Symmetry: C2
Subunit: 989 residues, 2 copies
Amino acid sequence: GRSLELGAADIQDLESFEAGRGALPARAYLQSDAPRLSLNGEWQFRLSPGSRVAPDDGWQLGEALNGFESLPVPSSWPMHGHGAPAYTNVQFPFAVEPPHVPEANPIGDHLVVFEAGPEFFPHALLRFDGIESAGTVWLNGVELGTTRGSRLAHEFDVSGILEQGENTLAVRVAQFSAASYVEDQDMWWLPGIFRDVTLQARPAAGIDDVFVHAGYDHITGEGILKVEASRGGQAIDAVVRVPELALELAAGTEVRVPAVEPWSAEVPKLYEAAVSAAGESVALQIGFRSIAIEDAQFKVNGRRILLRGVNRHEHHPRLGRVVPRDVVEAELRLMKQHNINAIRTSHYPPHPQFLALADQLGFYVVLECDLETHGFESAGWAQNPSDDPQWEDALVDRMRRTVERDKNHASVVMWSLGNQAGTGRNLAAMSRWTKDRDPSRPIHYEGDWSSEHVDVYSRMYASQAETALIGQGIEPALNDAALDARRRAMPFVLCEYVHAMGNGPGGMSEYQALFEKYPRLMGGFVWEWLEHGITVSTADGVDHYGYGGDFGEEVHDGNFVTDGLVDADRRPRPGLLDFKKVIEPLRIDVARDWTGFTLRNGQDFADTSAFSFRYEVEADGGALDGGTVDVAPVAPQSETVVELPGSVAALAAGLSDGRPAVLTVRAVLGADSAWADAGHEVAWGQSVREPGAPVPPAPVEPVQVQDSELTLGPVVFSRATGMPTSIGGVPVEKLGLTLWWAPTDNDLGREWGGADERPLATQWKDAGLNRLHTRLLGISANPGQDGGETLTVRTRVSAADKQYGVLVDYTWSTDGETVGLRTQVRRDGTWVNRGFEVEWARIGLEFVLGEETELVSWFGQGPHQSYPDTGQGARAGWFSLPLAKMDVEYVRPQECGARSGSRSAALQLGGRTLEICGDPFALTVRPYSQDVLDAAAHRPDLKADGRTYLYVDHALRGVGTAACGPGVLEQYRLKPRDADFILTLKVRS
Amino acid sequence: GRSLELGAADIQDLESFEAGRGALPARAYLQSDAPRLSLNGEWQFRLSPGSRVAPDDGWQLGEALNGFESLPVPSSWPMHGHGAPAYTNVQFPFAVEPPHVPEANPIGDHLVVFEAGPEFFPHALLRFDGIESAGTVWLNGVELGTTRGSRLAHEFDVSGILEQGENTLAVRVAQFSAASYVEDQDMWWLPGIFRDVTLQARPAAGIDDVFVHAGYDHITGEGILKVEASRGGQAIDAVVRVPELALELAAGTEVRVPAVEPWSAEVPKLYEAAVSAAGESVALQIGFRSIAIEDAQFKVNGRRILLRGVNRHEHHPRLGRVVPRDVVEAELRLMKQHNINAIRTSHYPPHPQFLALADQLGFYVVLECDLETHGFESAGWAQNPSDDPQWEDALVDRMRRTVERDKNHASVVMWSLGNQAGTGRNLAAMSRWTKDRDPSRPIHYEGDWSSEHVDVYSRMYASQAETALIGQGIEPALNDAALDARRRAMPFVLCEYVHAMGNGPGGMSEYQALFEKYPRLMGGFVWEWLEHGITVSTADGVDHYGYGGDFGEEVHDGNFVTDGLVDADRRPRPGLLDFKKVIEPLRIDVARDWTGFTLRNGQDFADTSAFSFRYEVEADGGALDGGTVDVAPVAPQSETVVELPGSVAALAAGLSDGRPAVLTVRAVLGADSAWADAGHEVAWGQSVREPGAPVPPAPVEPVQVQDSELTLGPVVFSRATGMPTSIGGVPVEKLGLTLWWAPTDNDLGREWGGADERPLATQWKDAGLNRLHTRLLGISANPGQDGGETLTVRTRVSAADKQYGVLVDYTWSTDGETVGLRTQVRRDGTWVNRGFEVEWARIGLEFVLGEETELVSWFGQGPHQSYPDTGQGARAGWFSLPLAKMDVEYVRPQECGARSGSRSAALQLGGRTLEICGDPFALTVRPYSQDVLDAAAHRPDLKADGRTYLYVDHALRGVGTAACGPGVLEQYRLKPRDADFILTLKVRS
Ligand SMILES: OC[C@H]1O[C@@H](O[C@H]2[C@H](O)[C@@H](O)[C@H](O)O[C@@H]2CO)[C@H](O)[C@@H](O)[C@H]1O
Ligand SMILES: OC[C@H]1O[C@@H](O)[C@H](O)[C@@H](O)[C@H]1O
Ligand SMILES: OC[C@H]1O[C@@H](O)[C@H](O)[C@@H](O)[C@H]1O
Ligand SMILES: OC[C@H]1O[C@@H](O)[C@H](O)[C@@H](O)[C@H]1O
Ligand code: NA
Ligand code: NA
Ligand code: NA
Ligand code: NA
Ligand code: NA
Ligand code: NA
Ligand code: NA
Ligand code: NA
């Protein structure tokens, strides 16, 4: 019988295994003097829910358009009300049956009219720098071809189709195609024409492609230069001029430049150059650098380098995959400002303009092909395109287009085949093609741990332990002896580590120490630079970020796309402030006696001449002394001891005993750089003179006894509960032990190994730690001093249906002015539940006060939060913040804002000030409870209730990176234990 | 130092291990001619949140009451706005640290004033029939004592405290006490004075206690009677008169009555008797029956009996543990009306009035002591009161009070020590005490499987398989040979089985067949008789039942308290209608040729004389013939063949081929009984003449082809989807394959064994069965008949991120009037996910129609729902119900309402009628979707949306009892398979 289904031809094309058709050969993105017209601007746009209903009503001609409306191009069209963004991590949002597409497949028809002057005749082309995921292109009704590879460029010859004067460009874009099966990155699904559309003239006697080869001989200091140039795939006569180096040479010939200044992330020297034929001239920036693997080390210009990296996705909270150039420039500057020297273009090539910026500002770039088949893993990689011969031409095309576009840029030091694509024949074909085309850059691919077709050994989230074994070259052998010998001769990189989701990442210091210790370790790139939050508005008008599930998705992965060091608007998370310190390229170790500091230059090429070294002594009453010291330039990987001026040490010796003072030595930029202004801080170190342990008040005040209340100086206790009801007129609504915090994203992840793979958050829930109850055992007053007395309140804390508990005794004392509080915790019974030992989040106290707090001040670490395995960037000092600024605006609210290492604190409750001192404690202050914080899925869910929630912790657990990778390291875990700790409280009015 | 805590003495008493103090000896509940005054009525009531704040302001005197308000007594005070009900199953709602109580412990002070006339002097007492959980009692300010054992009676001597005229009774009731640790039944926590308070005169020369011994000699037919009577614990002279039996005997002497009619559940003969002393007379109902264990069988009056039981809690949706007498009488009648003959007073003694009702209506009762320590299990039974010597006197007291109150009632055939209390020394002490006090009744206790201190082997939810092994006496041996020999000589009872929560219970038939086959098997009691729903009202005014979590509980167990055969208002669930049939005490097997039926009397004592045997033949057009047949009385456990009148068979032979007709034979009550009216149906059986397989219409109509639509007779298809868009003018919004249903309570429970302990609901979720997607592969028309043609639509069904699917082909045909639909399902790829084979709920079609349905009619099984392992009570016939009555009002909405075995159906959509015929299918019709049904937590969440959701299933899974006990039995599971099935559709206007 005859077929009756609609749209079968459009679908057959969408299900095609082949690369796009009709396109010109893949080439570099080149700055040319050839006439060009950007077609970016307001286009017309019509959306159809599938191919079988996509009109074939002659719309490509642009006449009588039924159903079209304005839409900007470039755009991600779900960012403008056409459908909605959808987020999955691994899972595909359609049935997995390659190459077939779902019936529900948004089809976006795009149309623009433009004018072509005589500059574009006879020869011109149209260039598309990105279409997600399948484009069909018509000009004046003539089909030019199709596009596959959503983050790759395509060019179409319009010679003889372009007409002088008015032209009509039509583009039909399907969201889903066969290509969606190889584009399963962890990120928002976002169809659209999301990068530039450009009309370019191709004058006769021009230059189609250029391949810059600029090597460096670190022994002689010579440059090795060869600039290839071709037209229609054939080498051509062109002249290469490099004025700064007094060079004029033919394209195609290799020359030795007697002396060049080499390119690196640290010193990104670029030489302006032009290669020109009679009809066209291309402008280049040349950076001389050679990449080599030697002695299981990754070396640039003869030196092993340390990669201080991030994984950079392209995302904008309002424009989707369209990242405006000012945002790119700003965020790259922000990276440099936080000591980052390396970028991985996770997991596709960036906008083509990114490359010159990376060359100029100075990043080591891992340029990664647009390939990811992650969603096939859950079926044992059955049907994985990476090993399906039918996909070979498509996957080689992706790699070719990746390599050809960006091959001229000194910042690209590695090519990556893709990400999470399994192992297979087509990856090997992509590697072979790349090695043959460009042997000057090592190949990276983490998916095949045997490393058969790569030049570096790459892993993601390997533990600190396993990294140390790899750093020593003693990891376990591959079964294949030949492959094992190859892999052991390779240097090692963490292409993703210390997953930066929510509160965290913990354990960054432990990785860094290994990076510094073992040459084989190349460093690592944090997952990831940014959170992919998408801005959402309410009638109230407040903005908050949305994540998976906030846009109607049938299947999604929640907030796992908000997992970055900065939010979608590039506002730093605390983890970035900590990261900056962890990777700081100079180490400053200030001497205890304040006579000087040790300075190690951790850079690979530059000396310390770019830095001004500054000291300041701060005390309770502000700065006491400061200035600048002269440091003879210290060579890379060398060390010296710098003397501080004698006045500094004399100041230290003069300090009254127990008077706190902090000496800070800082390395700042001596002059404006391309990425920050003079005075910008790069590295720092401190020495602290600690305040004495606070003296307990003499217990000279007696306890008044009344029917329902007890008074001990400024504290009033409920006789029924034994807990304070006010202190110095400040109402206390509750006081109790805390063992729990509102789970972080990490606490919601499974820690693998052991028989227990409940997330820590679930272990806590099962154990009842979020719902502690207190039983009063007794209240007793005891002889103090000179008629005074102490008050002891004996309690037991546990939870419904549990037999384990802790005995908590509070001992109060007062001389009338200061209140002394001693807390003793003792385990009662075995803290085991569901067959596994219960771990605690904390050993602390929660004070719930019946008034709001306007200001929080403290002496300790800051200004930002710190937990046991974080806070590297929190320095010692005196800090003061309004209550709102004590919080951290994670998209999904969670435990955050603790200030570990606090020696004193002051809360301002209107006209009263509550002071807390004692041996070091963590400080947290919130206008809402832990139960409201845990329940809240988005920041608007957090409502202040008129109270102050004050947390004083004697011990905290670490935060780890268990959402993906290692959990809390052993030294930072918190198993049930006995404890005791002392505090002092005072209210001033 | 000196103590300052408040309320320490009240708390010390609450934490006491001892039974109550001050009470009179435990005795029977006896009907006496002694003056009595019920103090039930409106009392005054004040609530305090804990003992440390409970005022000691002299309120016991009743003068100047500060803070008291009216409250009825008896009451569960959280049922009247004082606090709230709270539901936990196993978990305790307080920290487990016996004997200690939480600080948050509702204290309810109760006060009443009453008048005592000279009838109550010199001697009187106050009787309390239940206080949850700890009472302290004052009369005119004089403390009488305390109460422990919340469902047990306590009596206090008021002689010399009661004053003539006005008296003031004060009762302080704590919700929680040490006793809460032994009262952890799965049920609502409900403090209050929840049963009668009675002032009773104790005239001199009276009778305090009576112990009736009324045995039966089934060989001679003699009664063996001895009636003990005592005053102050000493036997006394009393006269026992039994007029009906011409007896006058002294209390304390055993006599042989020459002939008595024995008592049983079937024939609950009772003889009125009075035992009287000079000062007092007690009225008894005596039932002569002896209980004996012989040949591993539980026998009454010389015969092994079959228990057809339920577990009966005491609950009322508005009054809590207060069950009004009219509700008791009504529900016991409803039980008899559903063939129930046995009750287990789960898990405490009932109201004392229950016992006479059970004697009179006729139930075999397992009278169970108020003891349950279930919450200690999760700690390995550490600190279990059942094995703690400090709790021995408290636990023996509970058993003593249980036994003494109810020992005179013939309906009590077993004493139970308690429930879910572990094993231990104090249970053994309770058993020893009981055996010594009353050797006439076997002891039951499931908690100790070794059965060391019991006389029957009791289990709960043993599988059908394990029950069959136990029935054959081949279960595995106990390690202790002596205990194994004892246990193998015991009969076996399921004290709880076929958990009746939500849709279900499945697998009842398989248990019953074993009960009938194996004498050792005593039968079983369903868990449980009623749902504990608590009525909740909204401003709208609709009522719905609340369950755990609906009342603010910090910890709770959700709808696990709504797990019954009837709802809280005693409205039957379908499971009750099925249960009634499963346990029917006569079996009627109607002959295929309609000449007669086989009749087996399944009763243990009665013959069939109480029944009238009626036949009716029904056809499409109603009743055709009917009448009554005379059956010579058939003895218990005998069998006969009854001839039907010749006209019946002649009617069968005369039927036109393929014309449906149902012969039903019924056993109804020939006369009013005490529990139902004449004509009440007890047993039934059917023989069906099936309609022919419906003829497929001749495919003589062609398919019209248009741009966006196809027409094939009355069906209009969307050319883009291939699915029907209307049939005979009825709009079709969607048509697709179904494999999933909204999980039942059972589907949410874990099926133990295997490596997969995900609940089936979770397996489905993980597999994507709730979110199927369909891809169109092709649409084709093919040669039919006489220019007609068939239309085939080829699809594939799968779900996002899955590689497995099914190929579904629809083949449509029409002669213009009827529509023929053939559906073919074929597995594509292996249906495995997370390492385990995916199971299906169904193989069906969902039609979503764009109009509402008012009426649903069908020929099949009904009227109520039926699933493969249920529907025993759905009989063959013609049924017709409004749409709302097709649903089942489970408290948590869930899959329900399917009518399996349907041969034809008619949906009325206004003025059009949609008819569906074909080989047997299940029918379901709803005004809302499956996703709305699954999301709904309470019935108000179900909103109609203007559509009709029609489900036609070719195969269904069973429902099992996996919420607690066996899941779906193997024969009723539904693994992925290929399938094909035919339907016919027709619309009449
Ligand atoms: O934010 C996650 C991050 O993960 C990398 O790979 C992870 C993956 O997230 C996780 O789902 C799987 O279980 O483990 C992998 C590594 O162990 C991805 O490469 C990255 O793009 C992100 O998706
Ligand atoms: O000032 C030293 C600099 O070294 C670069 O390699 C790095 O990218 C910069 O962020 C900064 O740390
Ligand atoms: O390439 C081999 C590797 O493949 C990964 O996908 C897998 O998680 C590792 O266990 C390792 O076997
Ligand atoms: O009494 C012994 C029994 O105790 C139960 O609590 C337990 O679940 C059974 O496995 C059996 O060992
Ligand atoms: Na994805
Ligand atoms: Na992510
Ligand atoms: Na918290
Ligand atoms: Na939260
Ligand atoms: Na309970
Ligand atoms: Na229950
Ligand atoms: Na359903
Ligand atoms: Na539901």
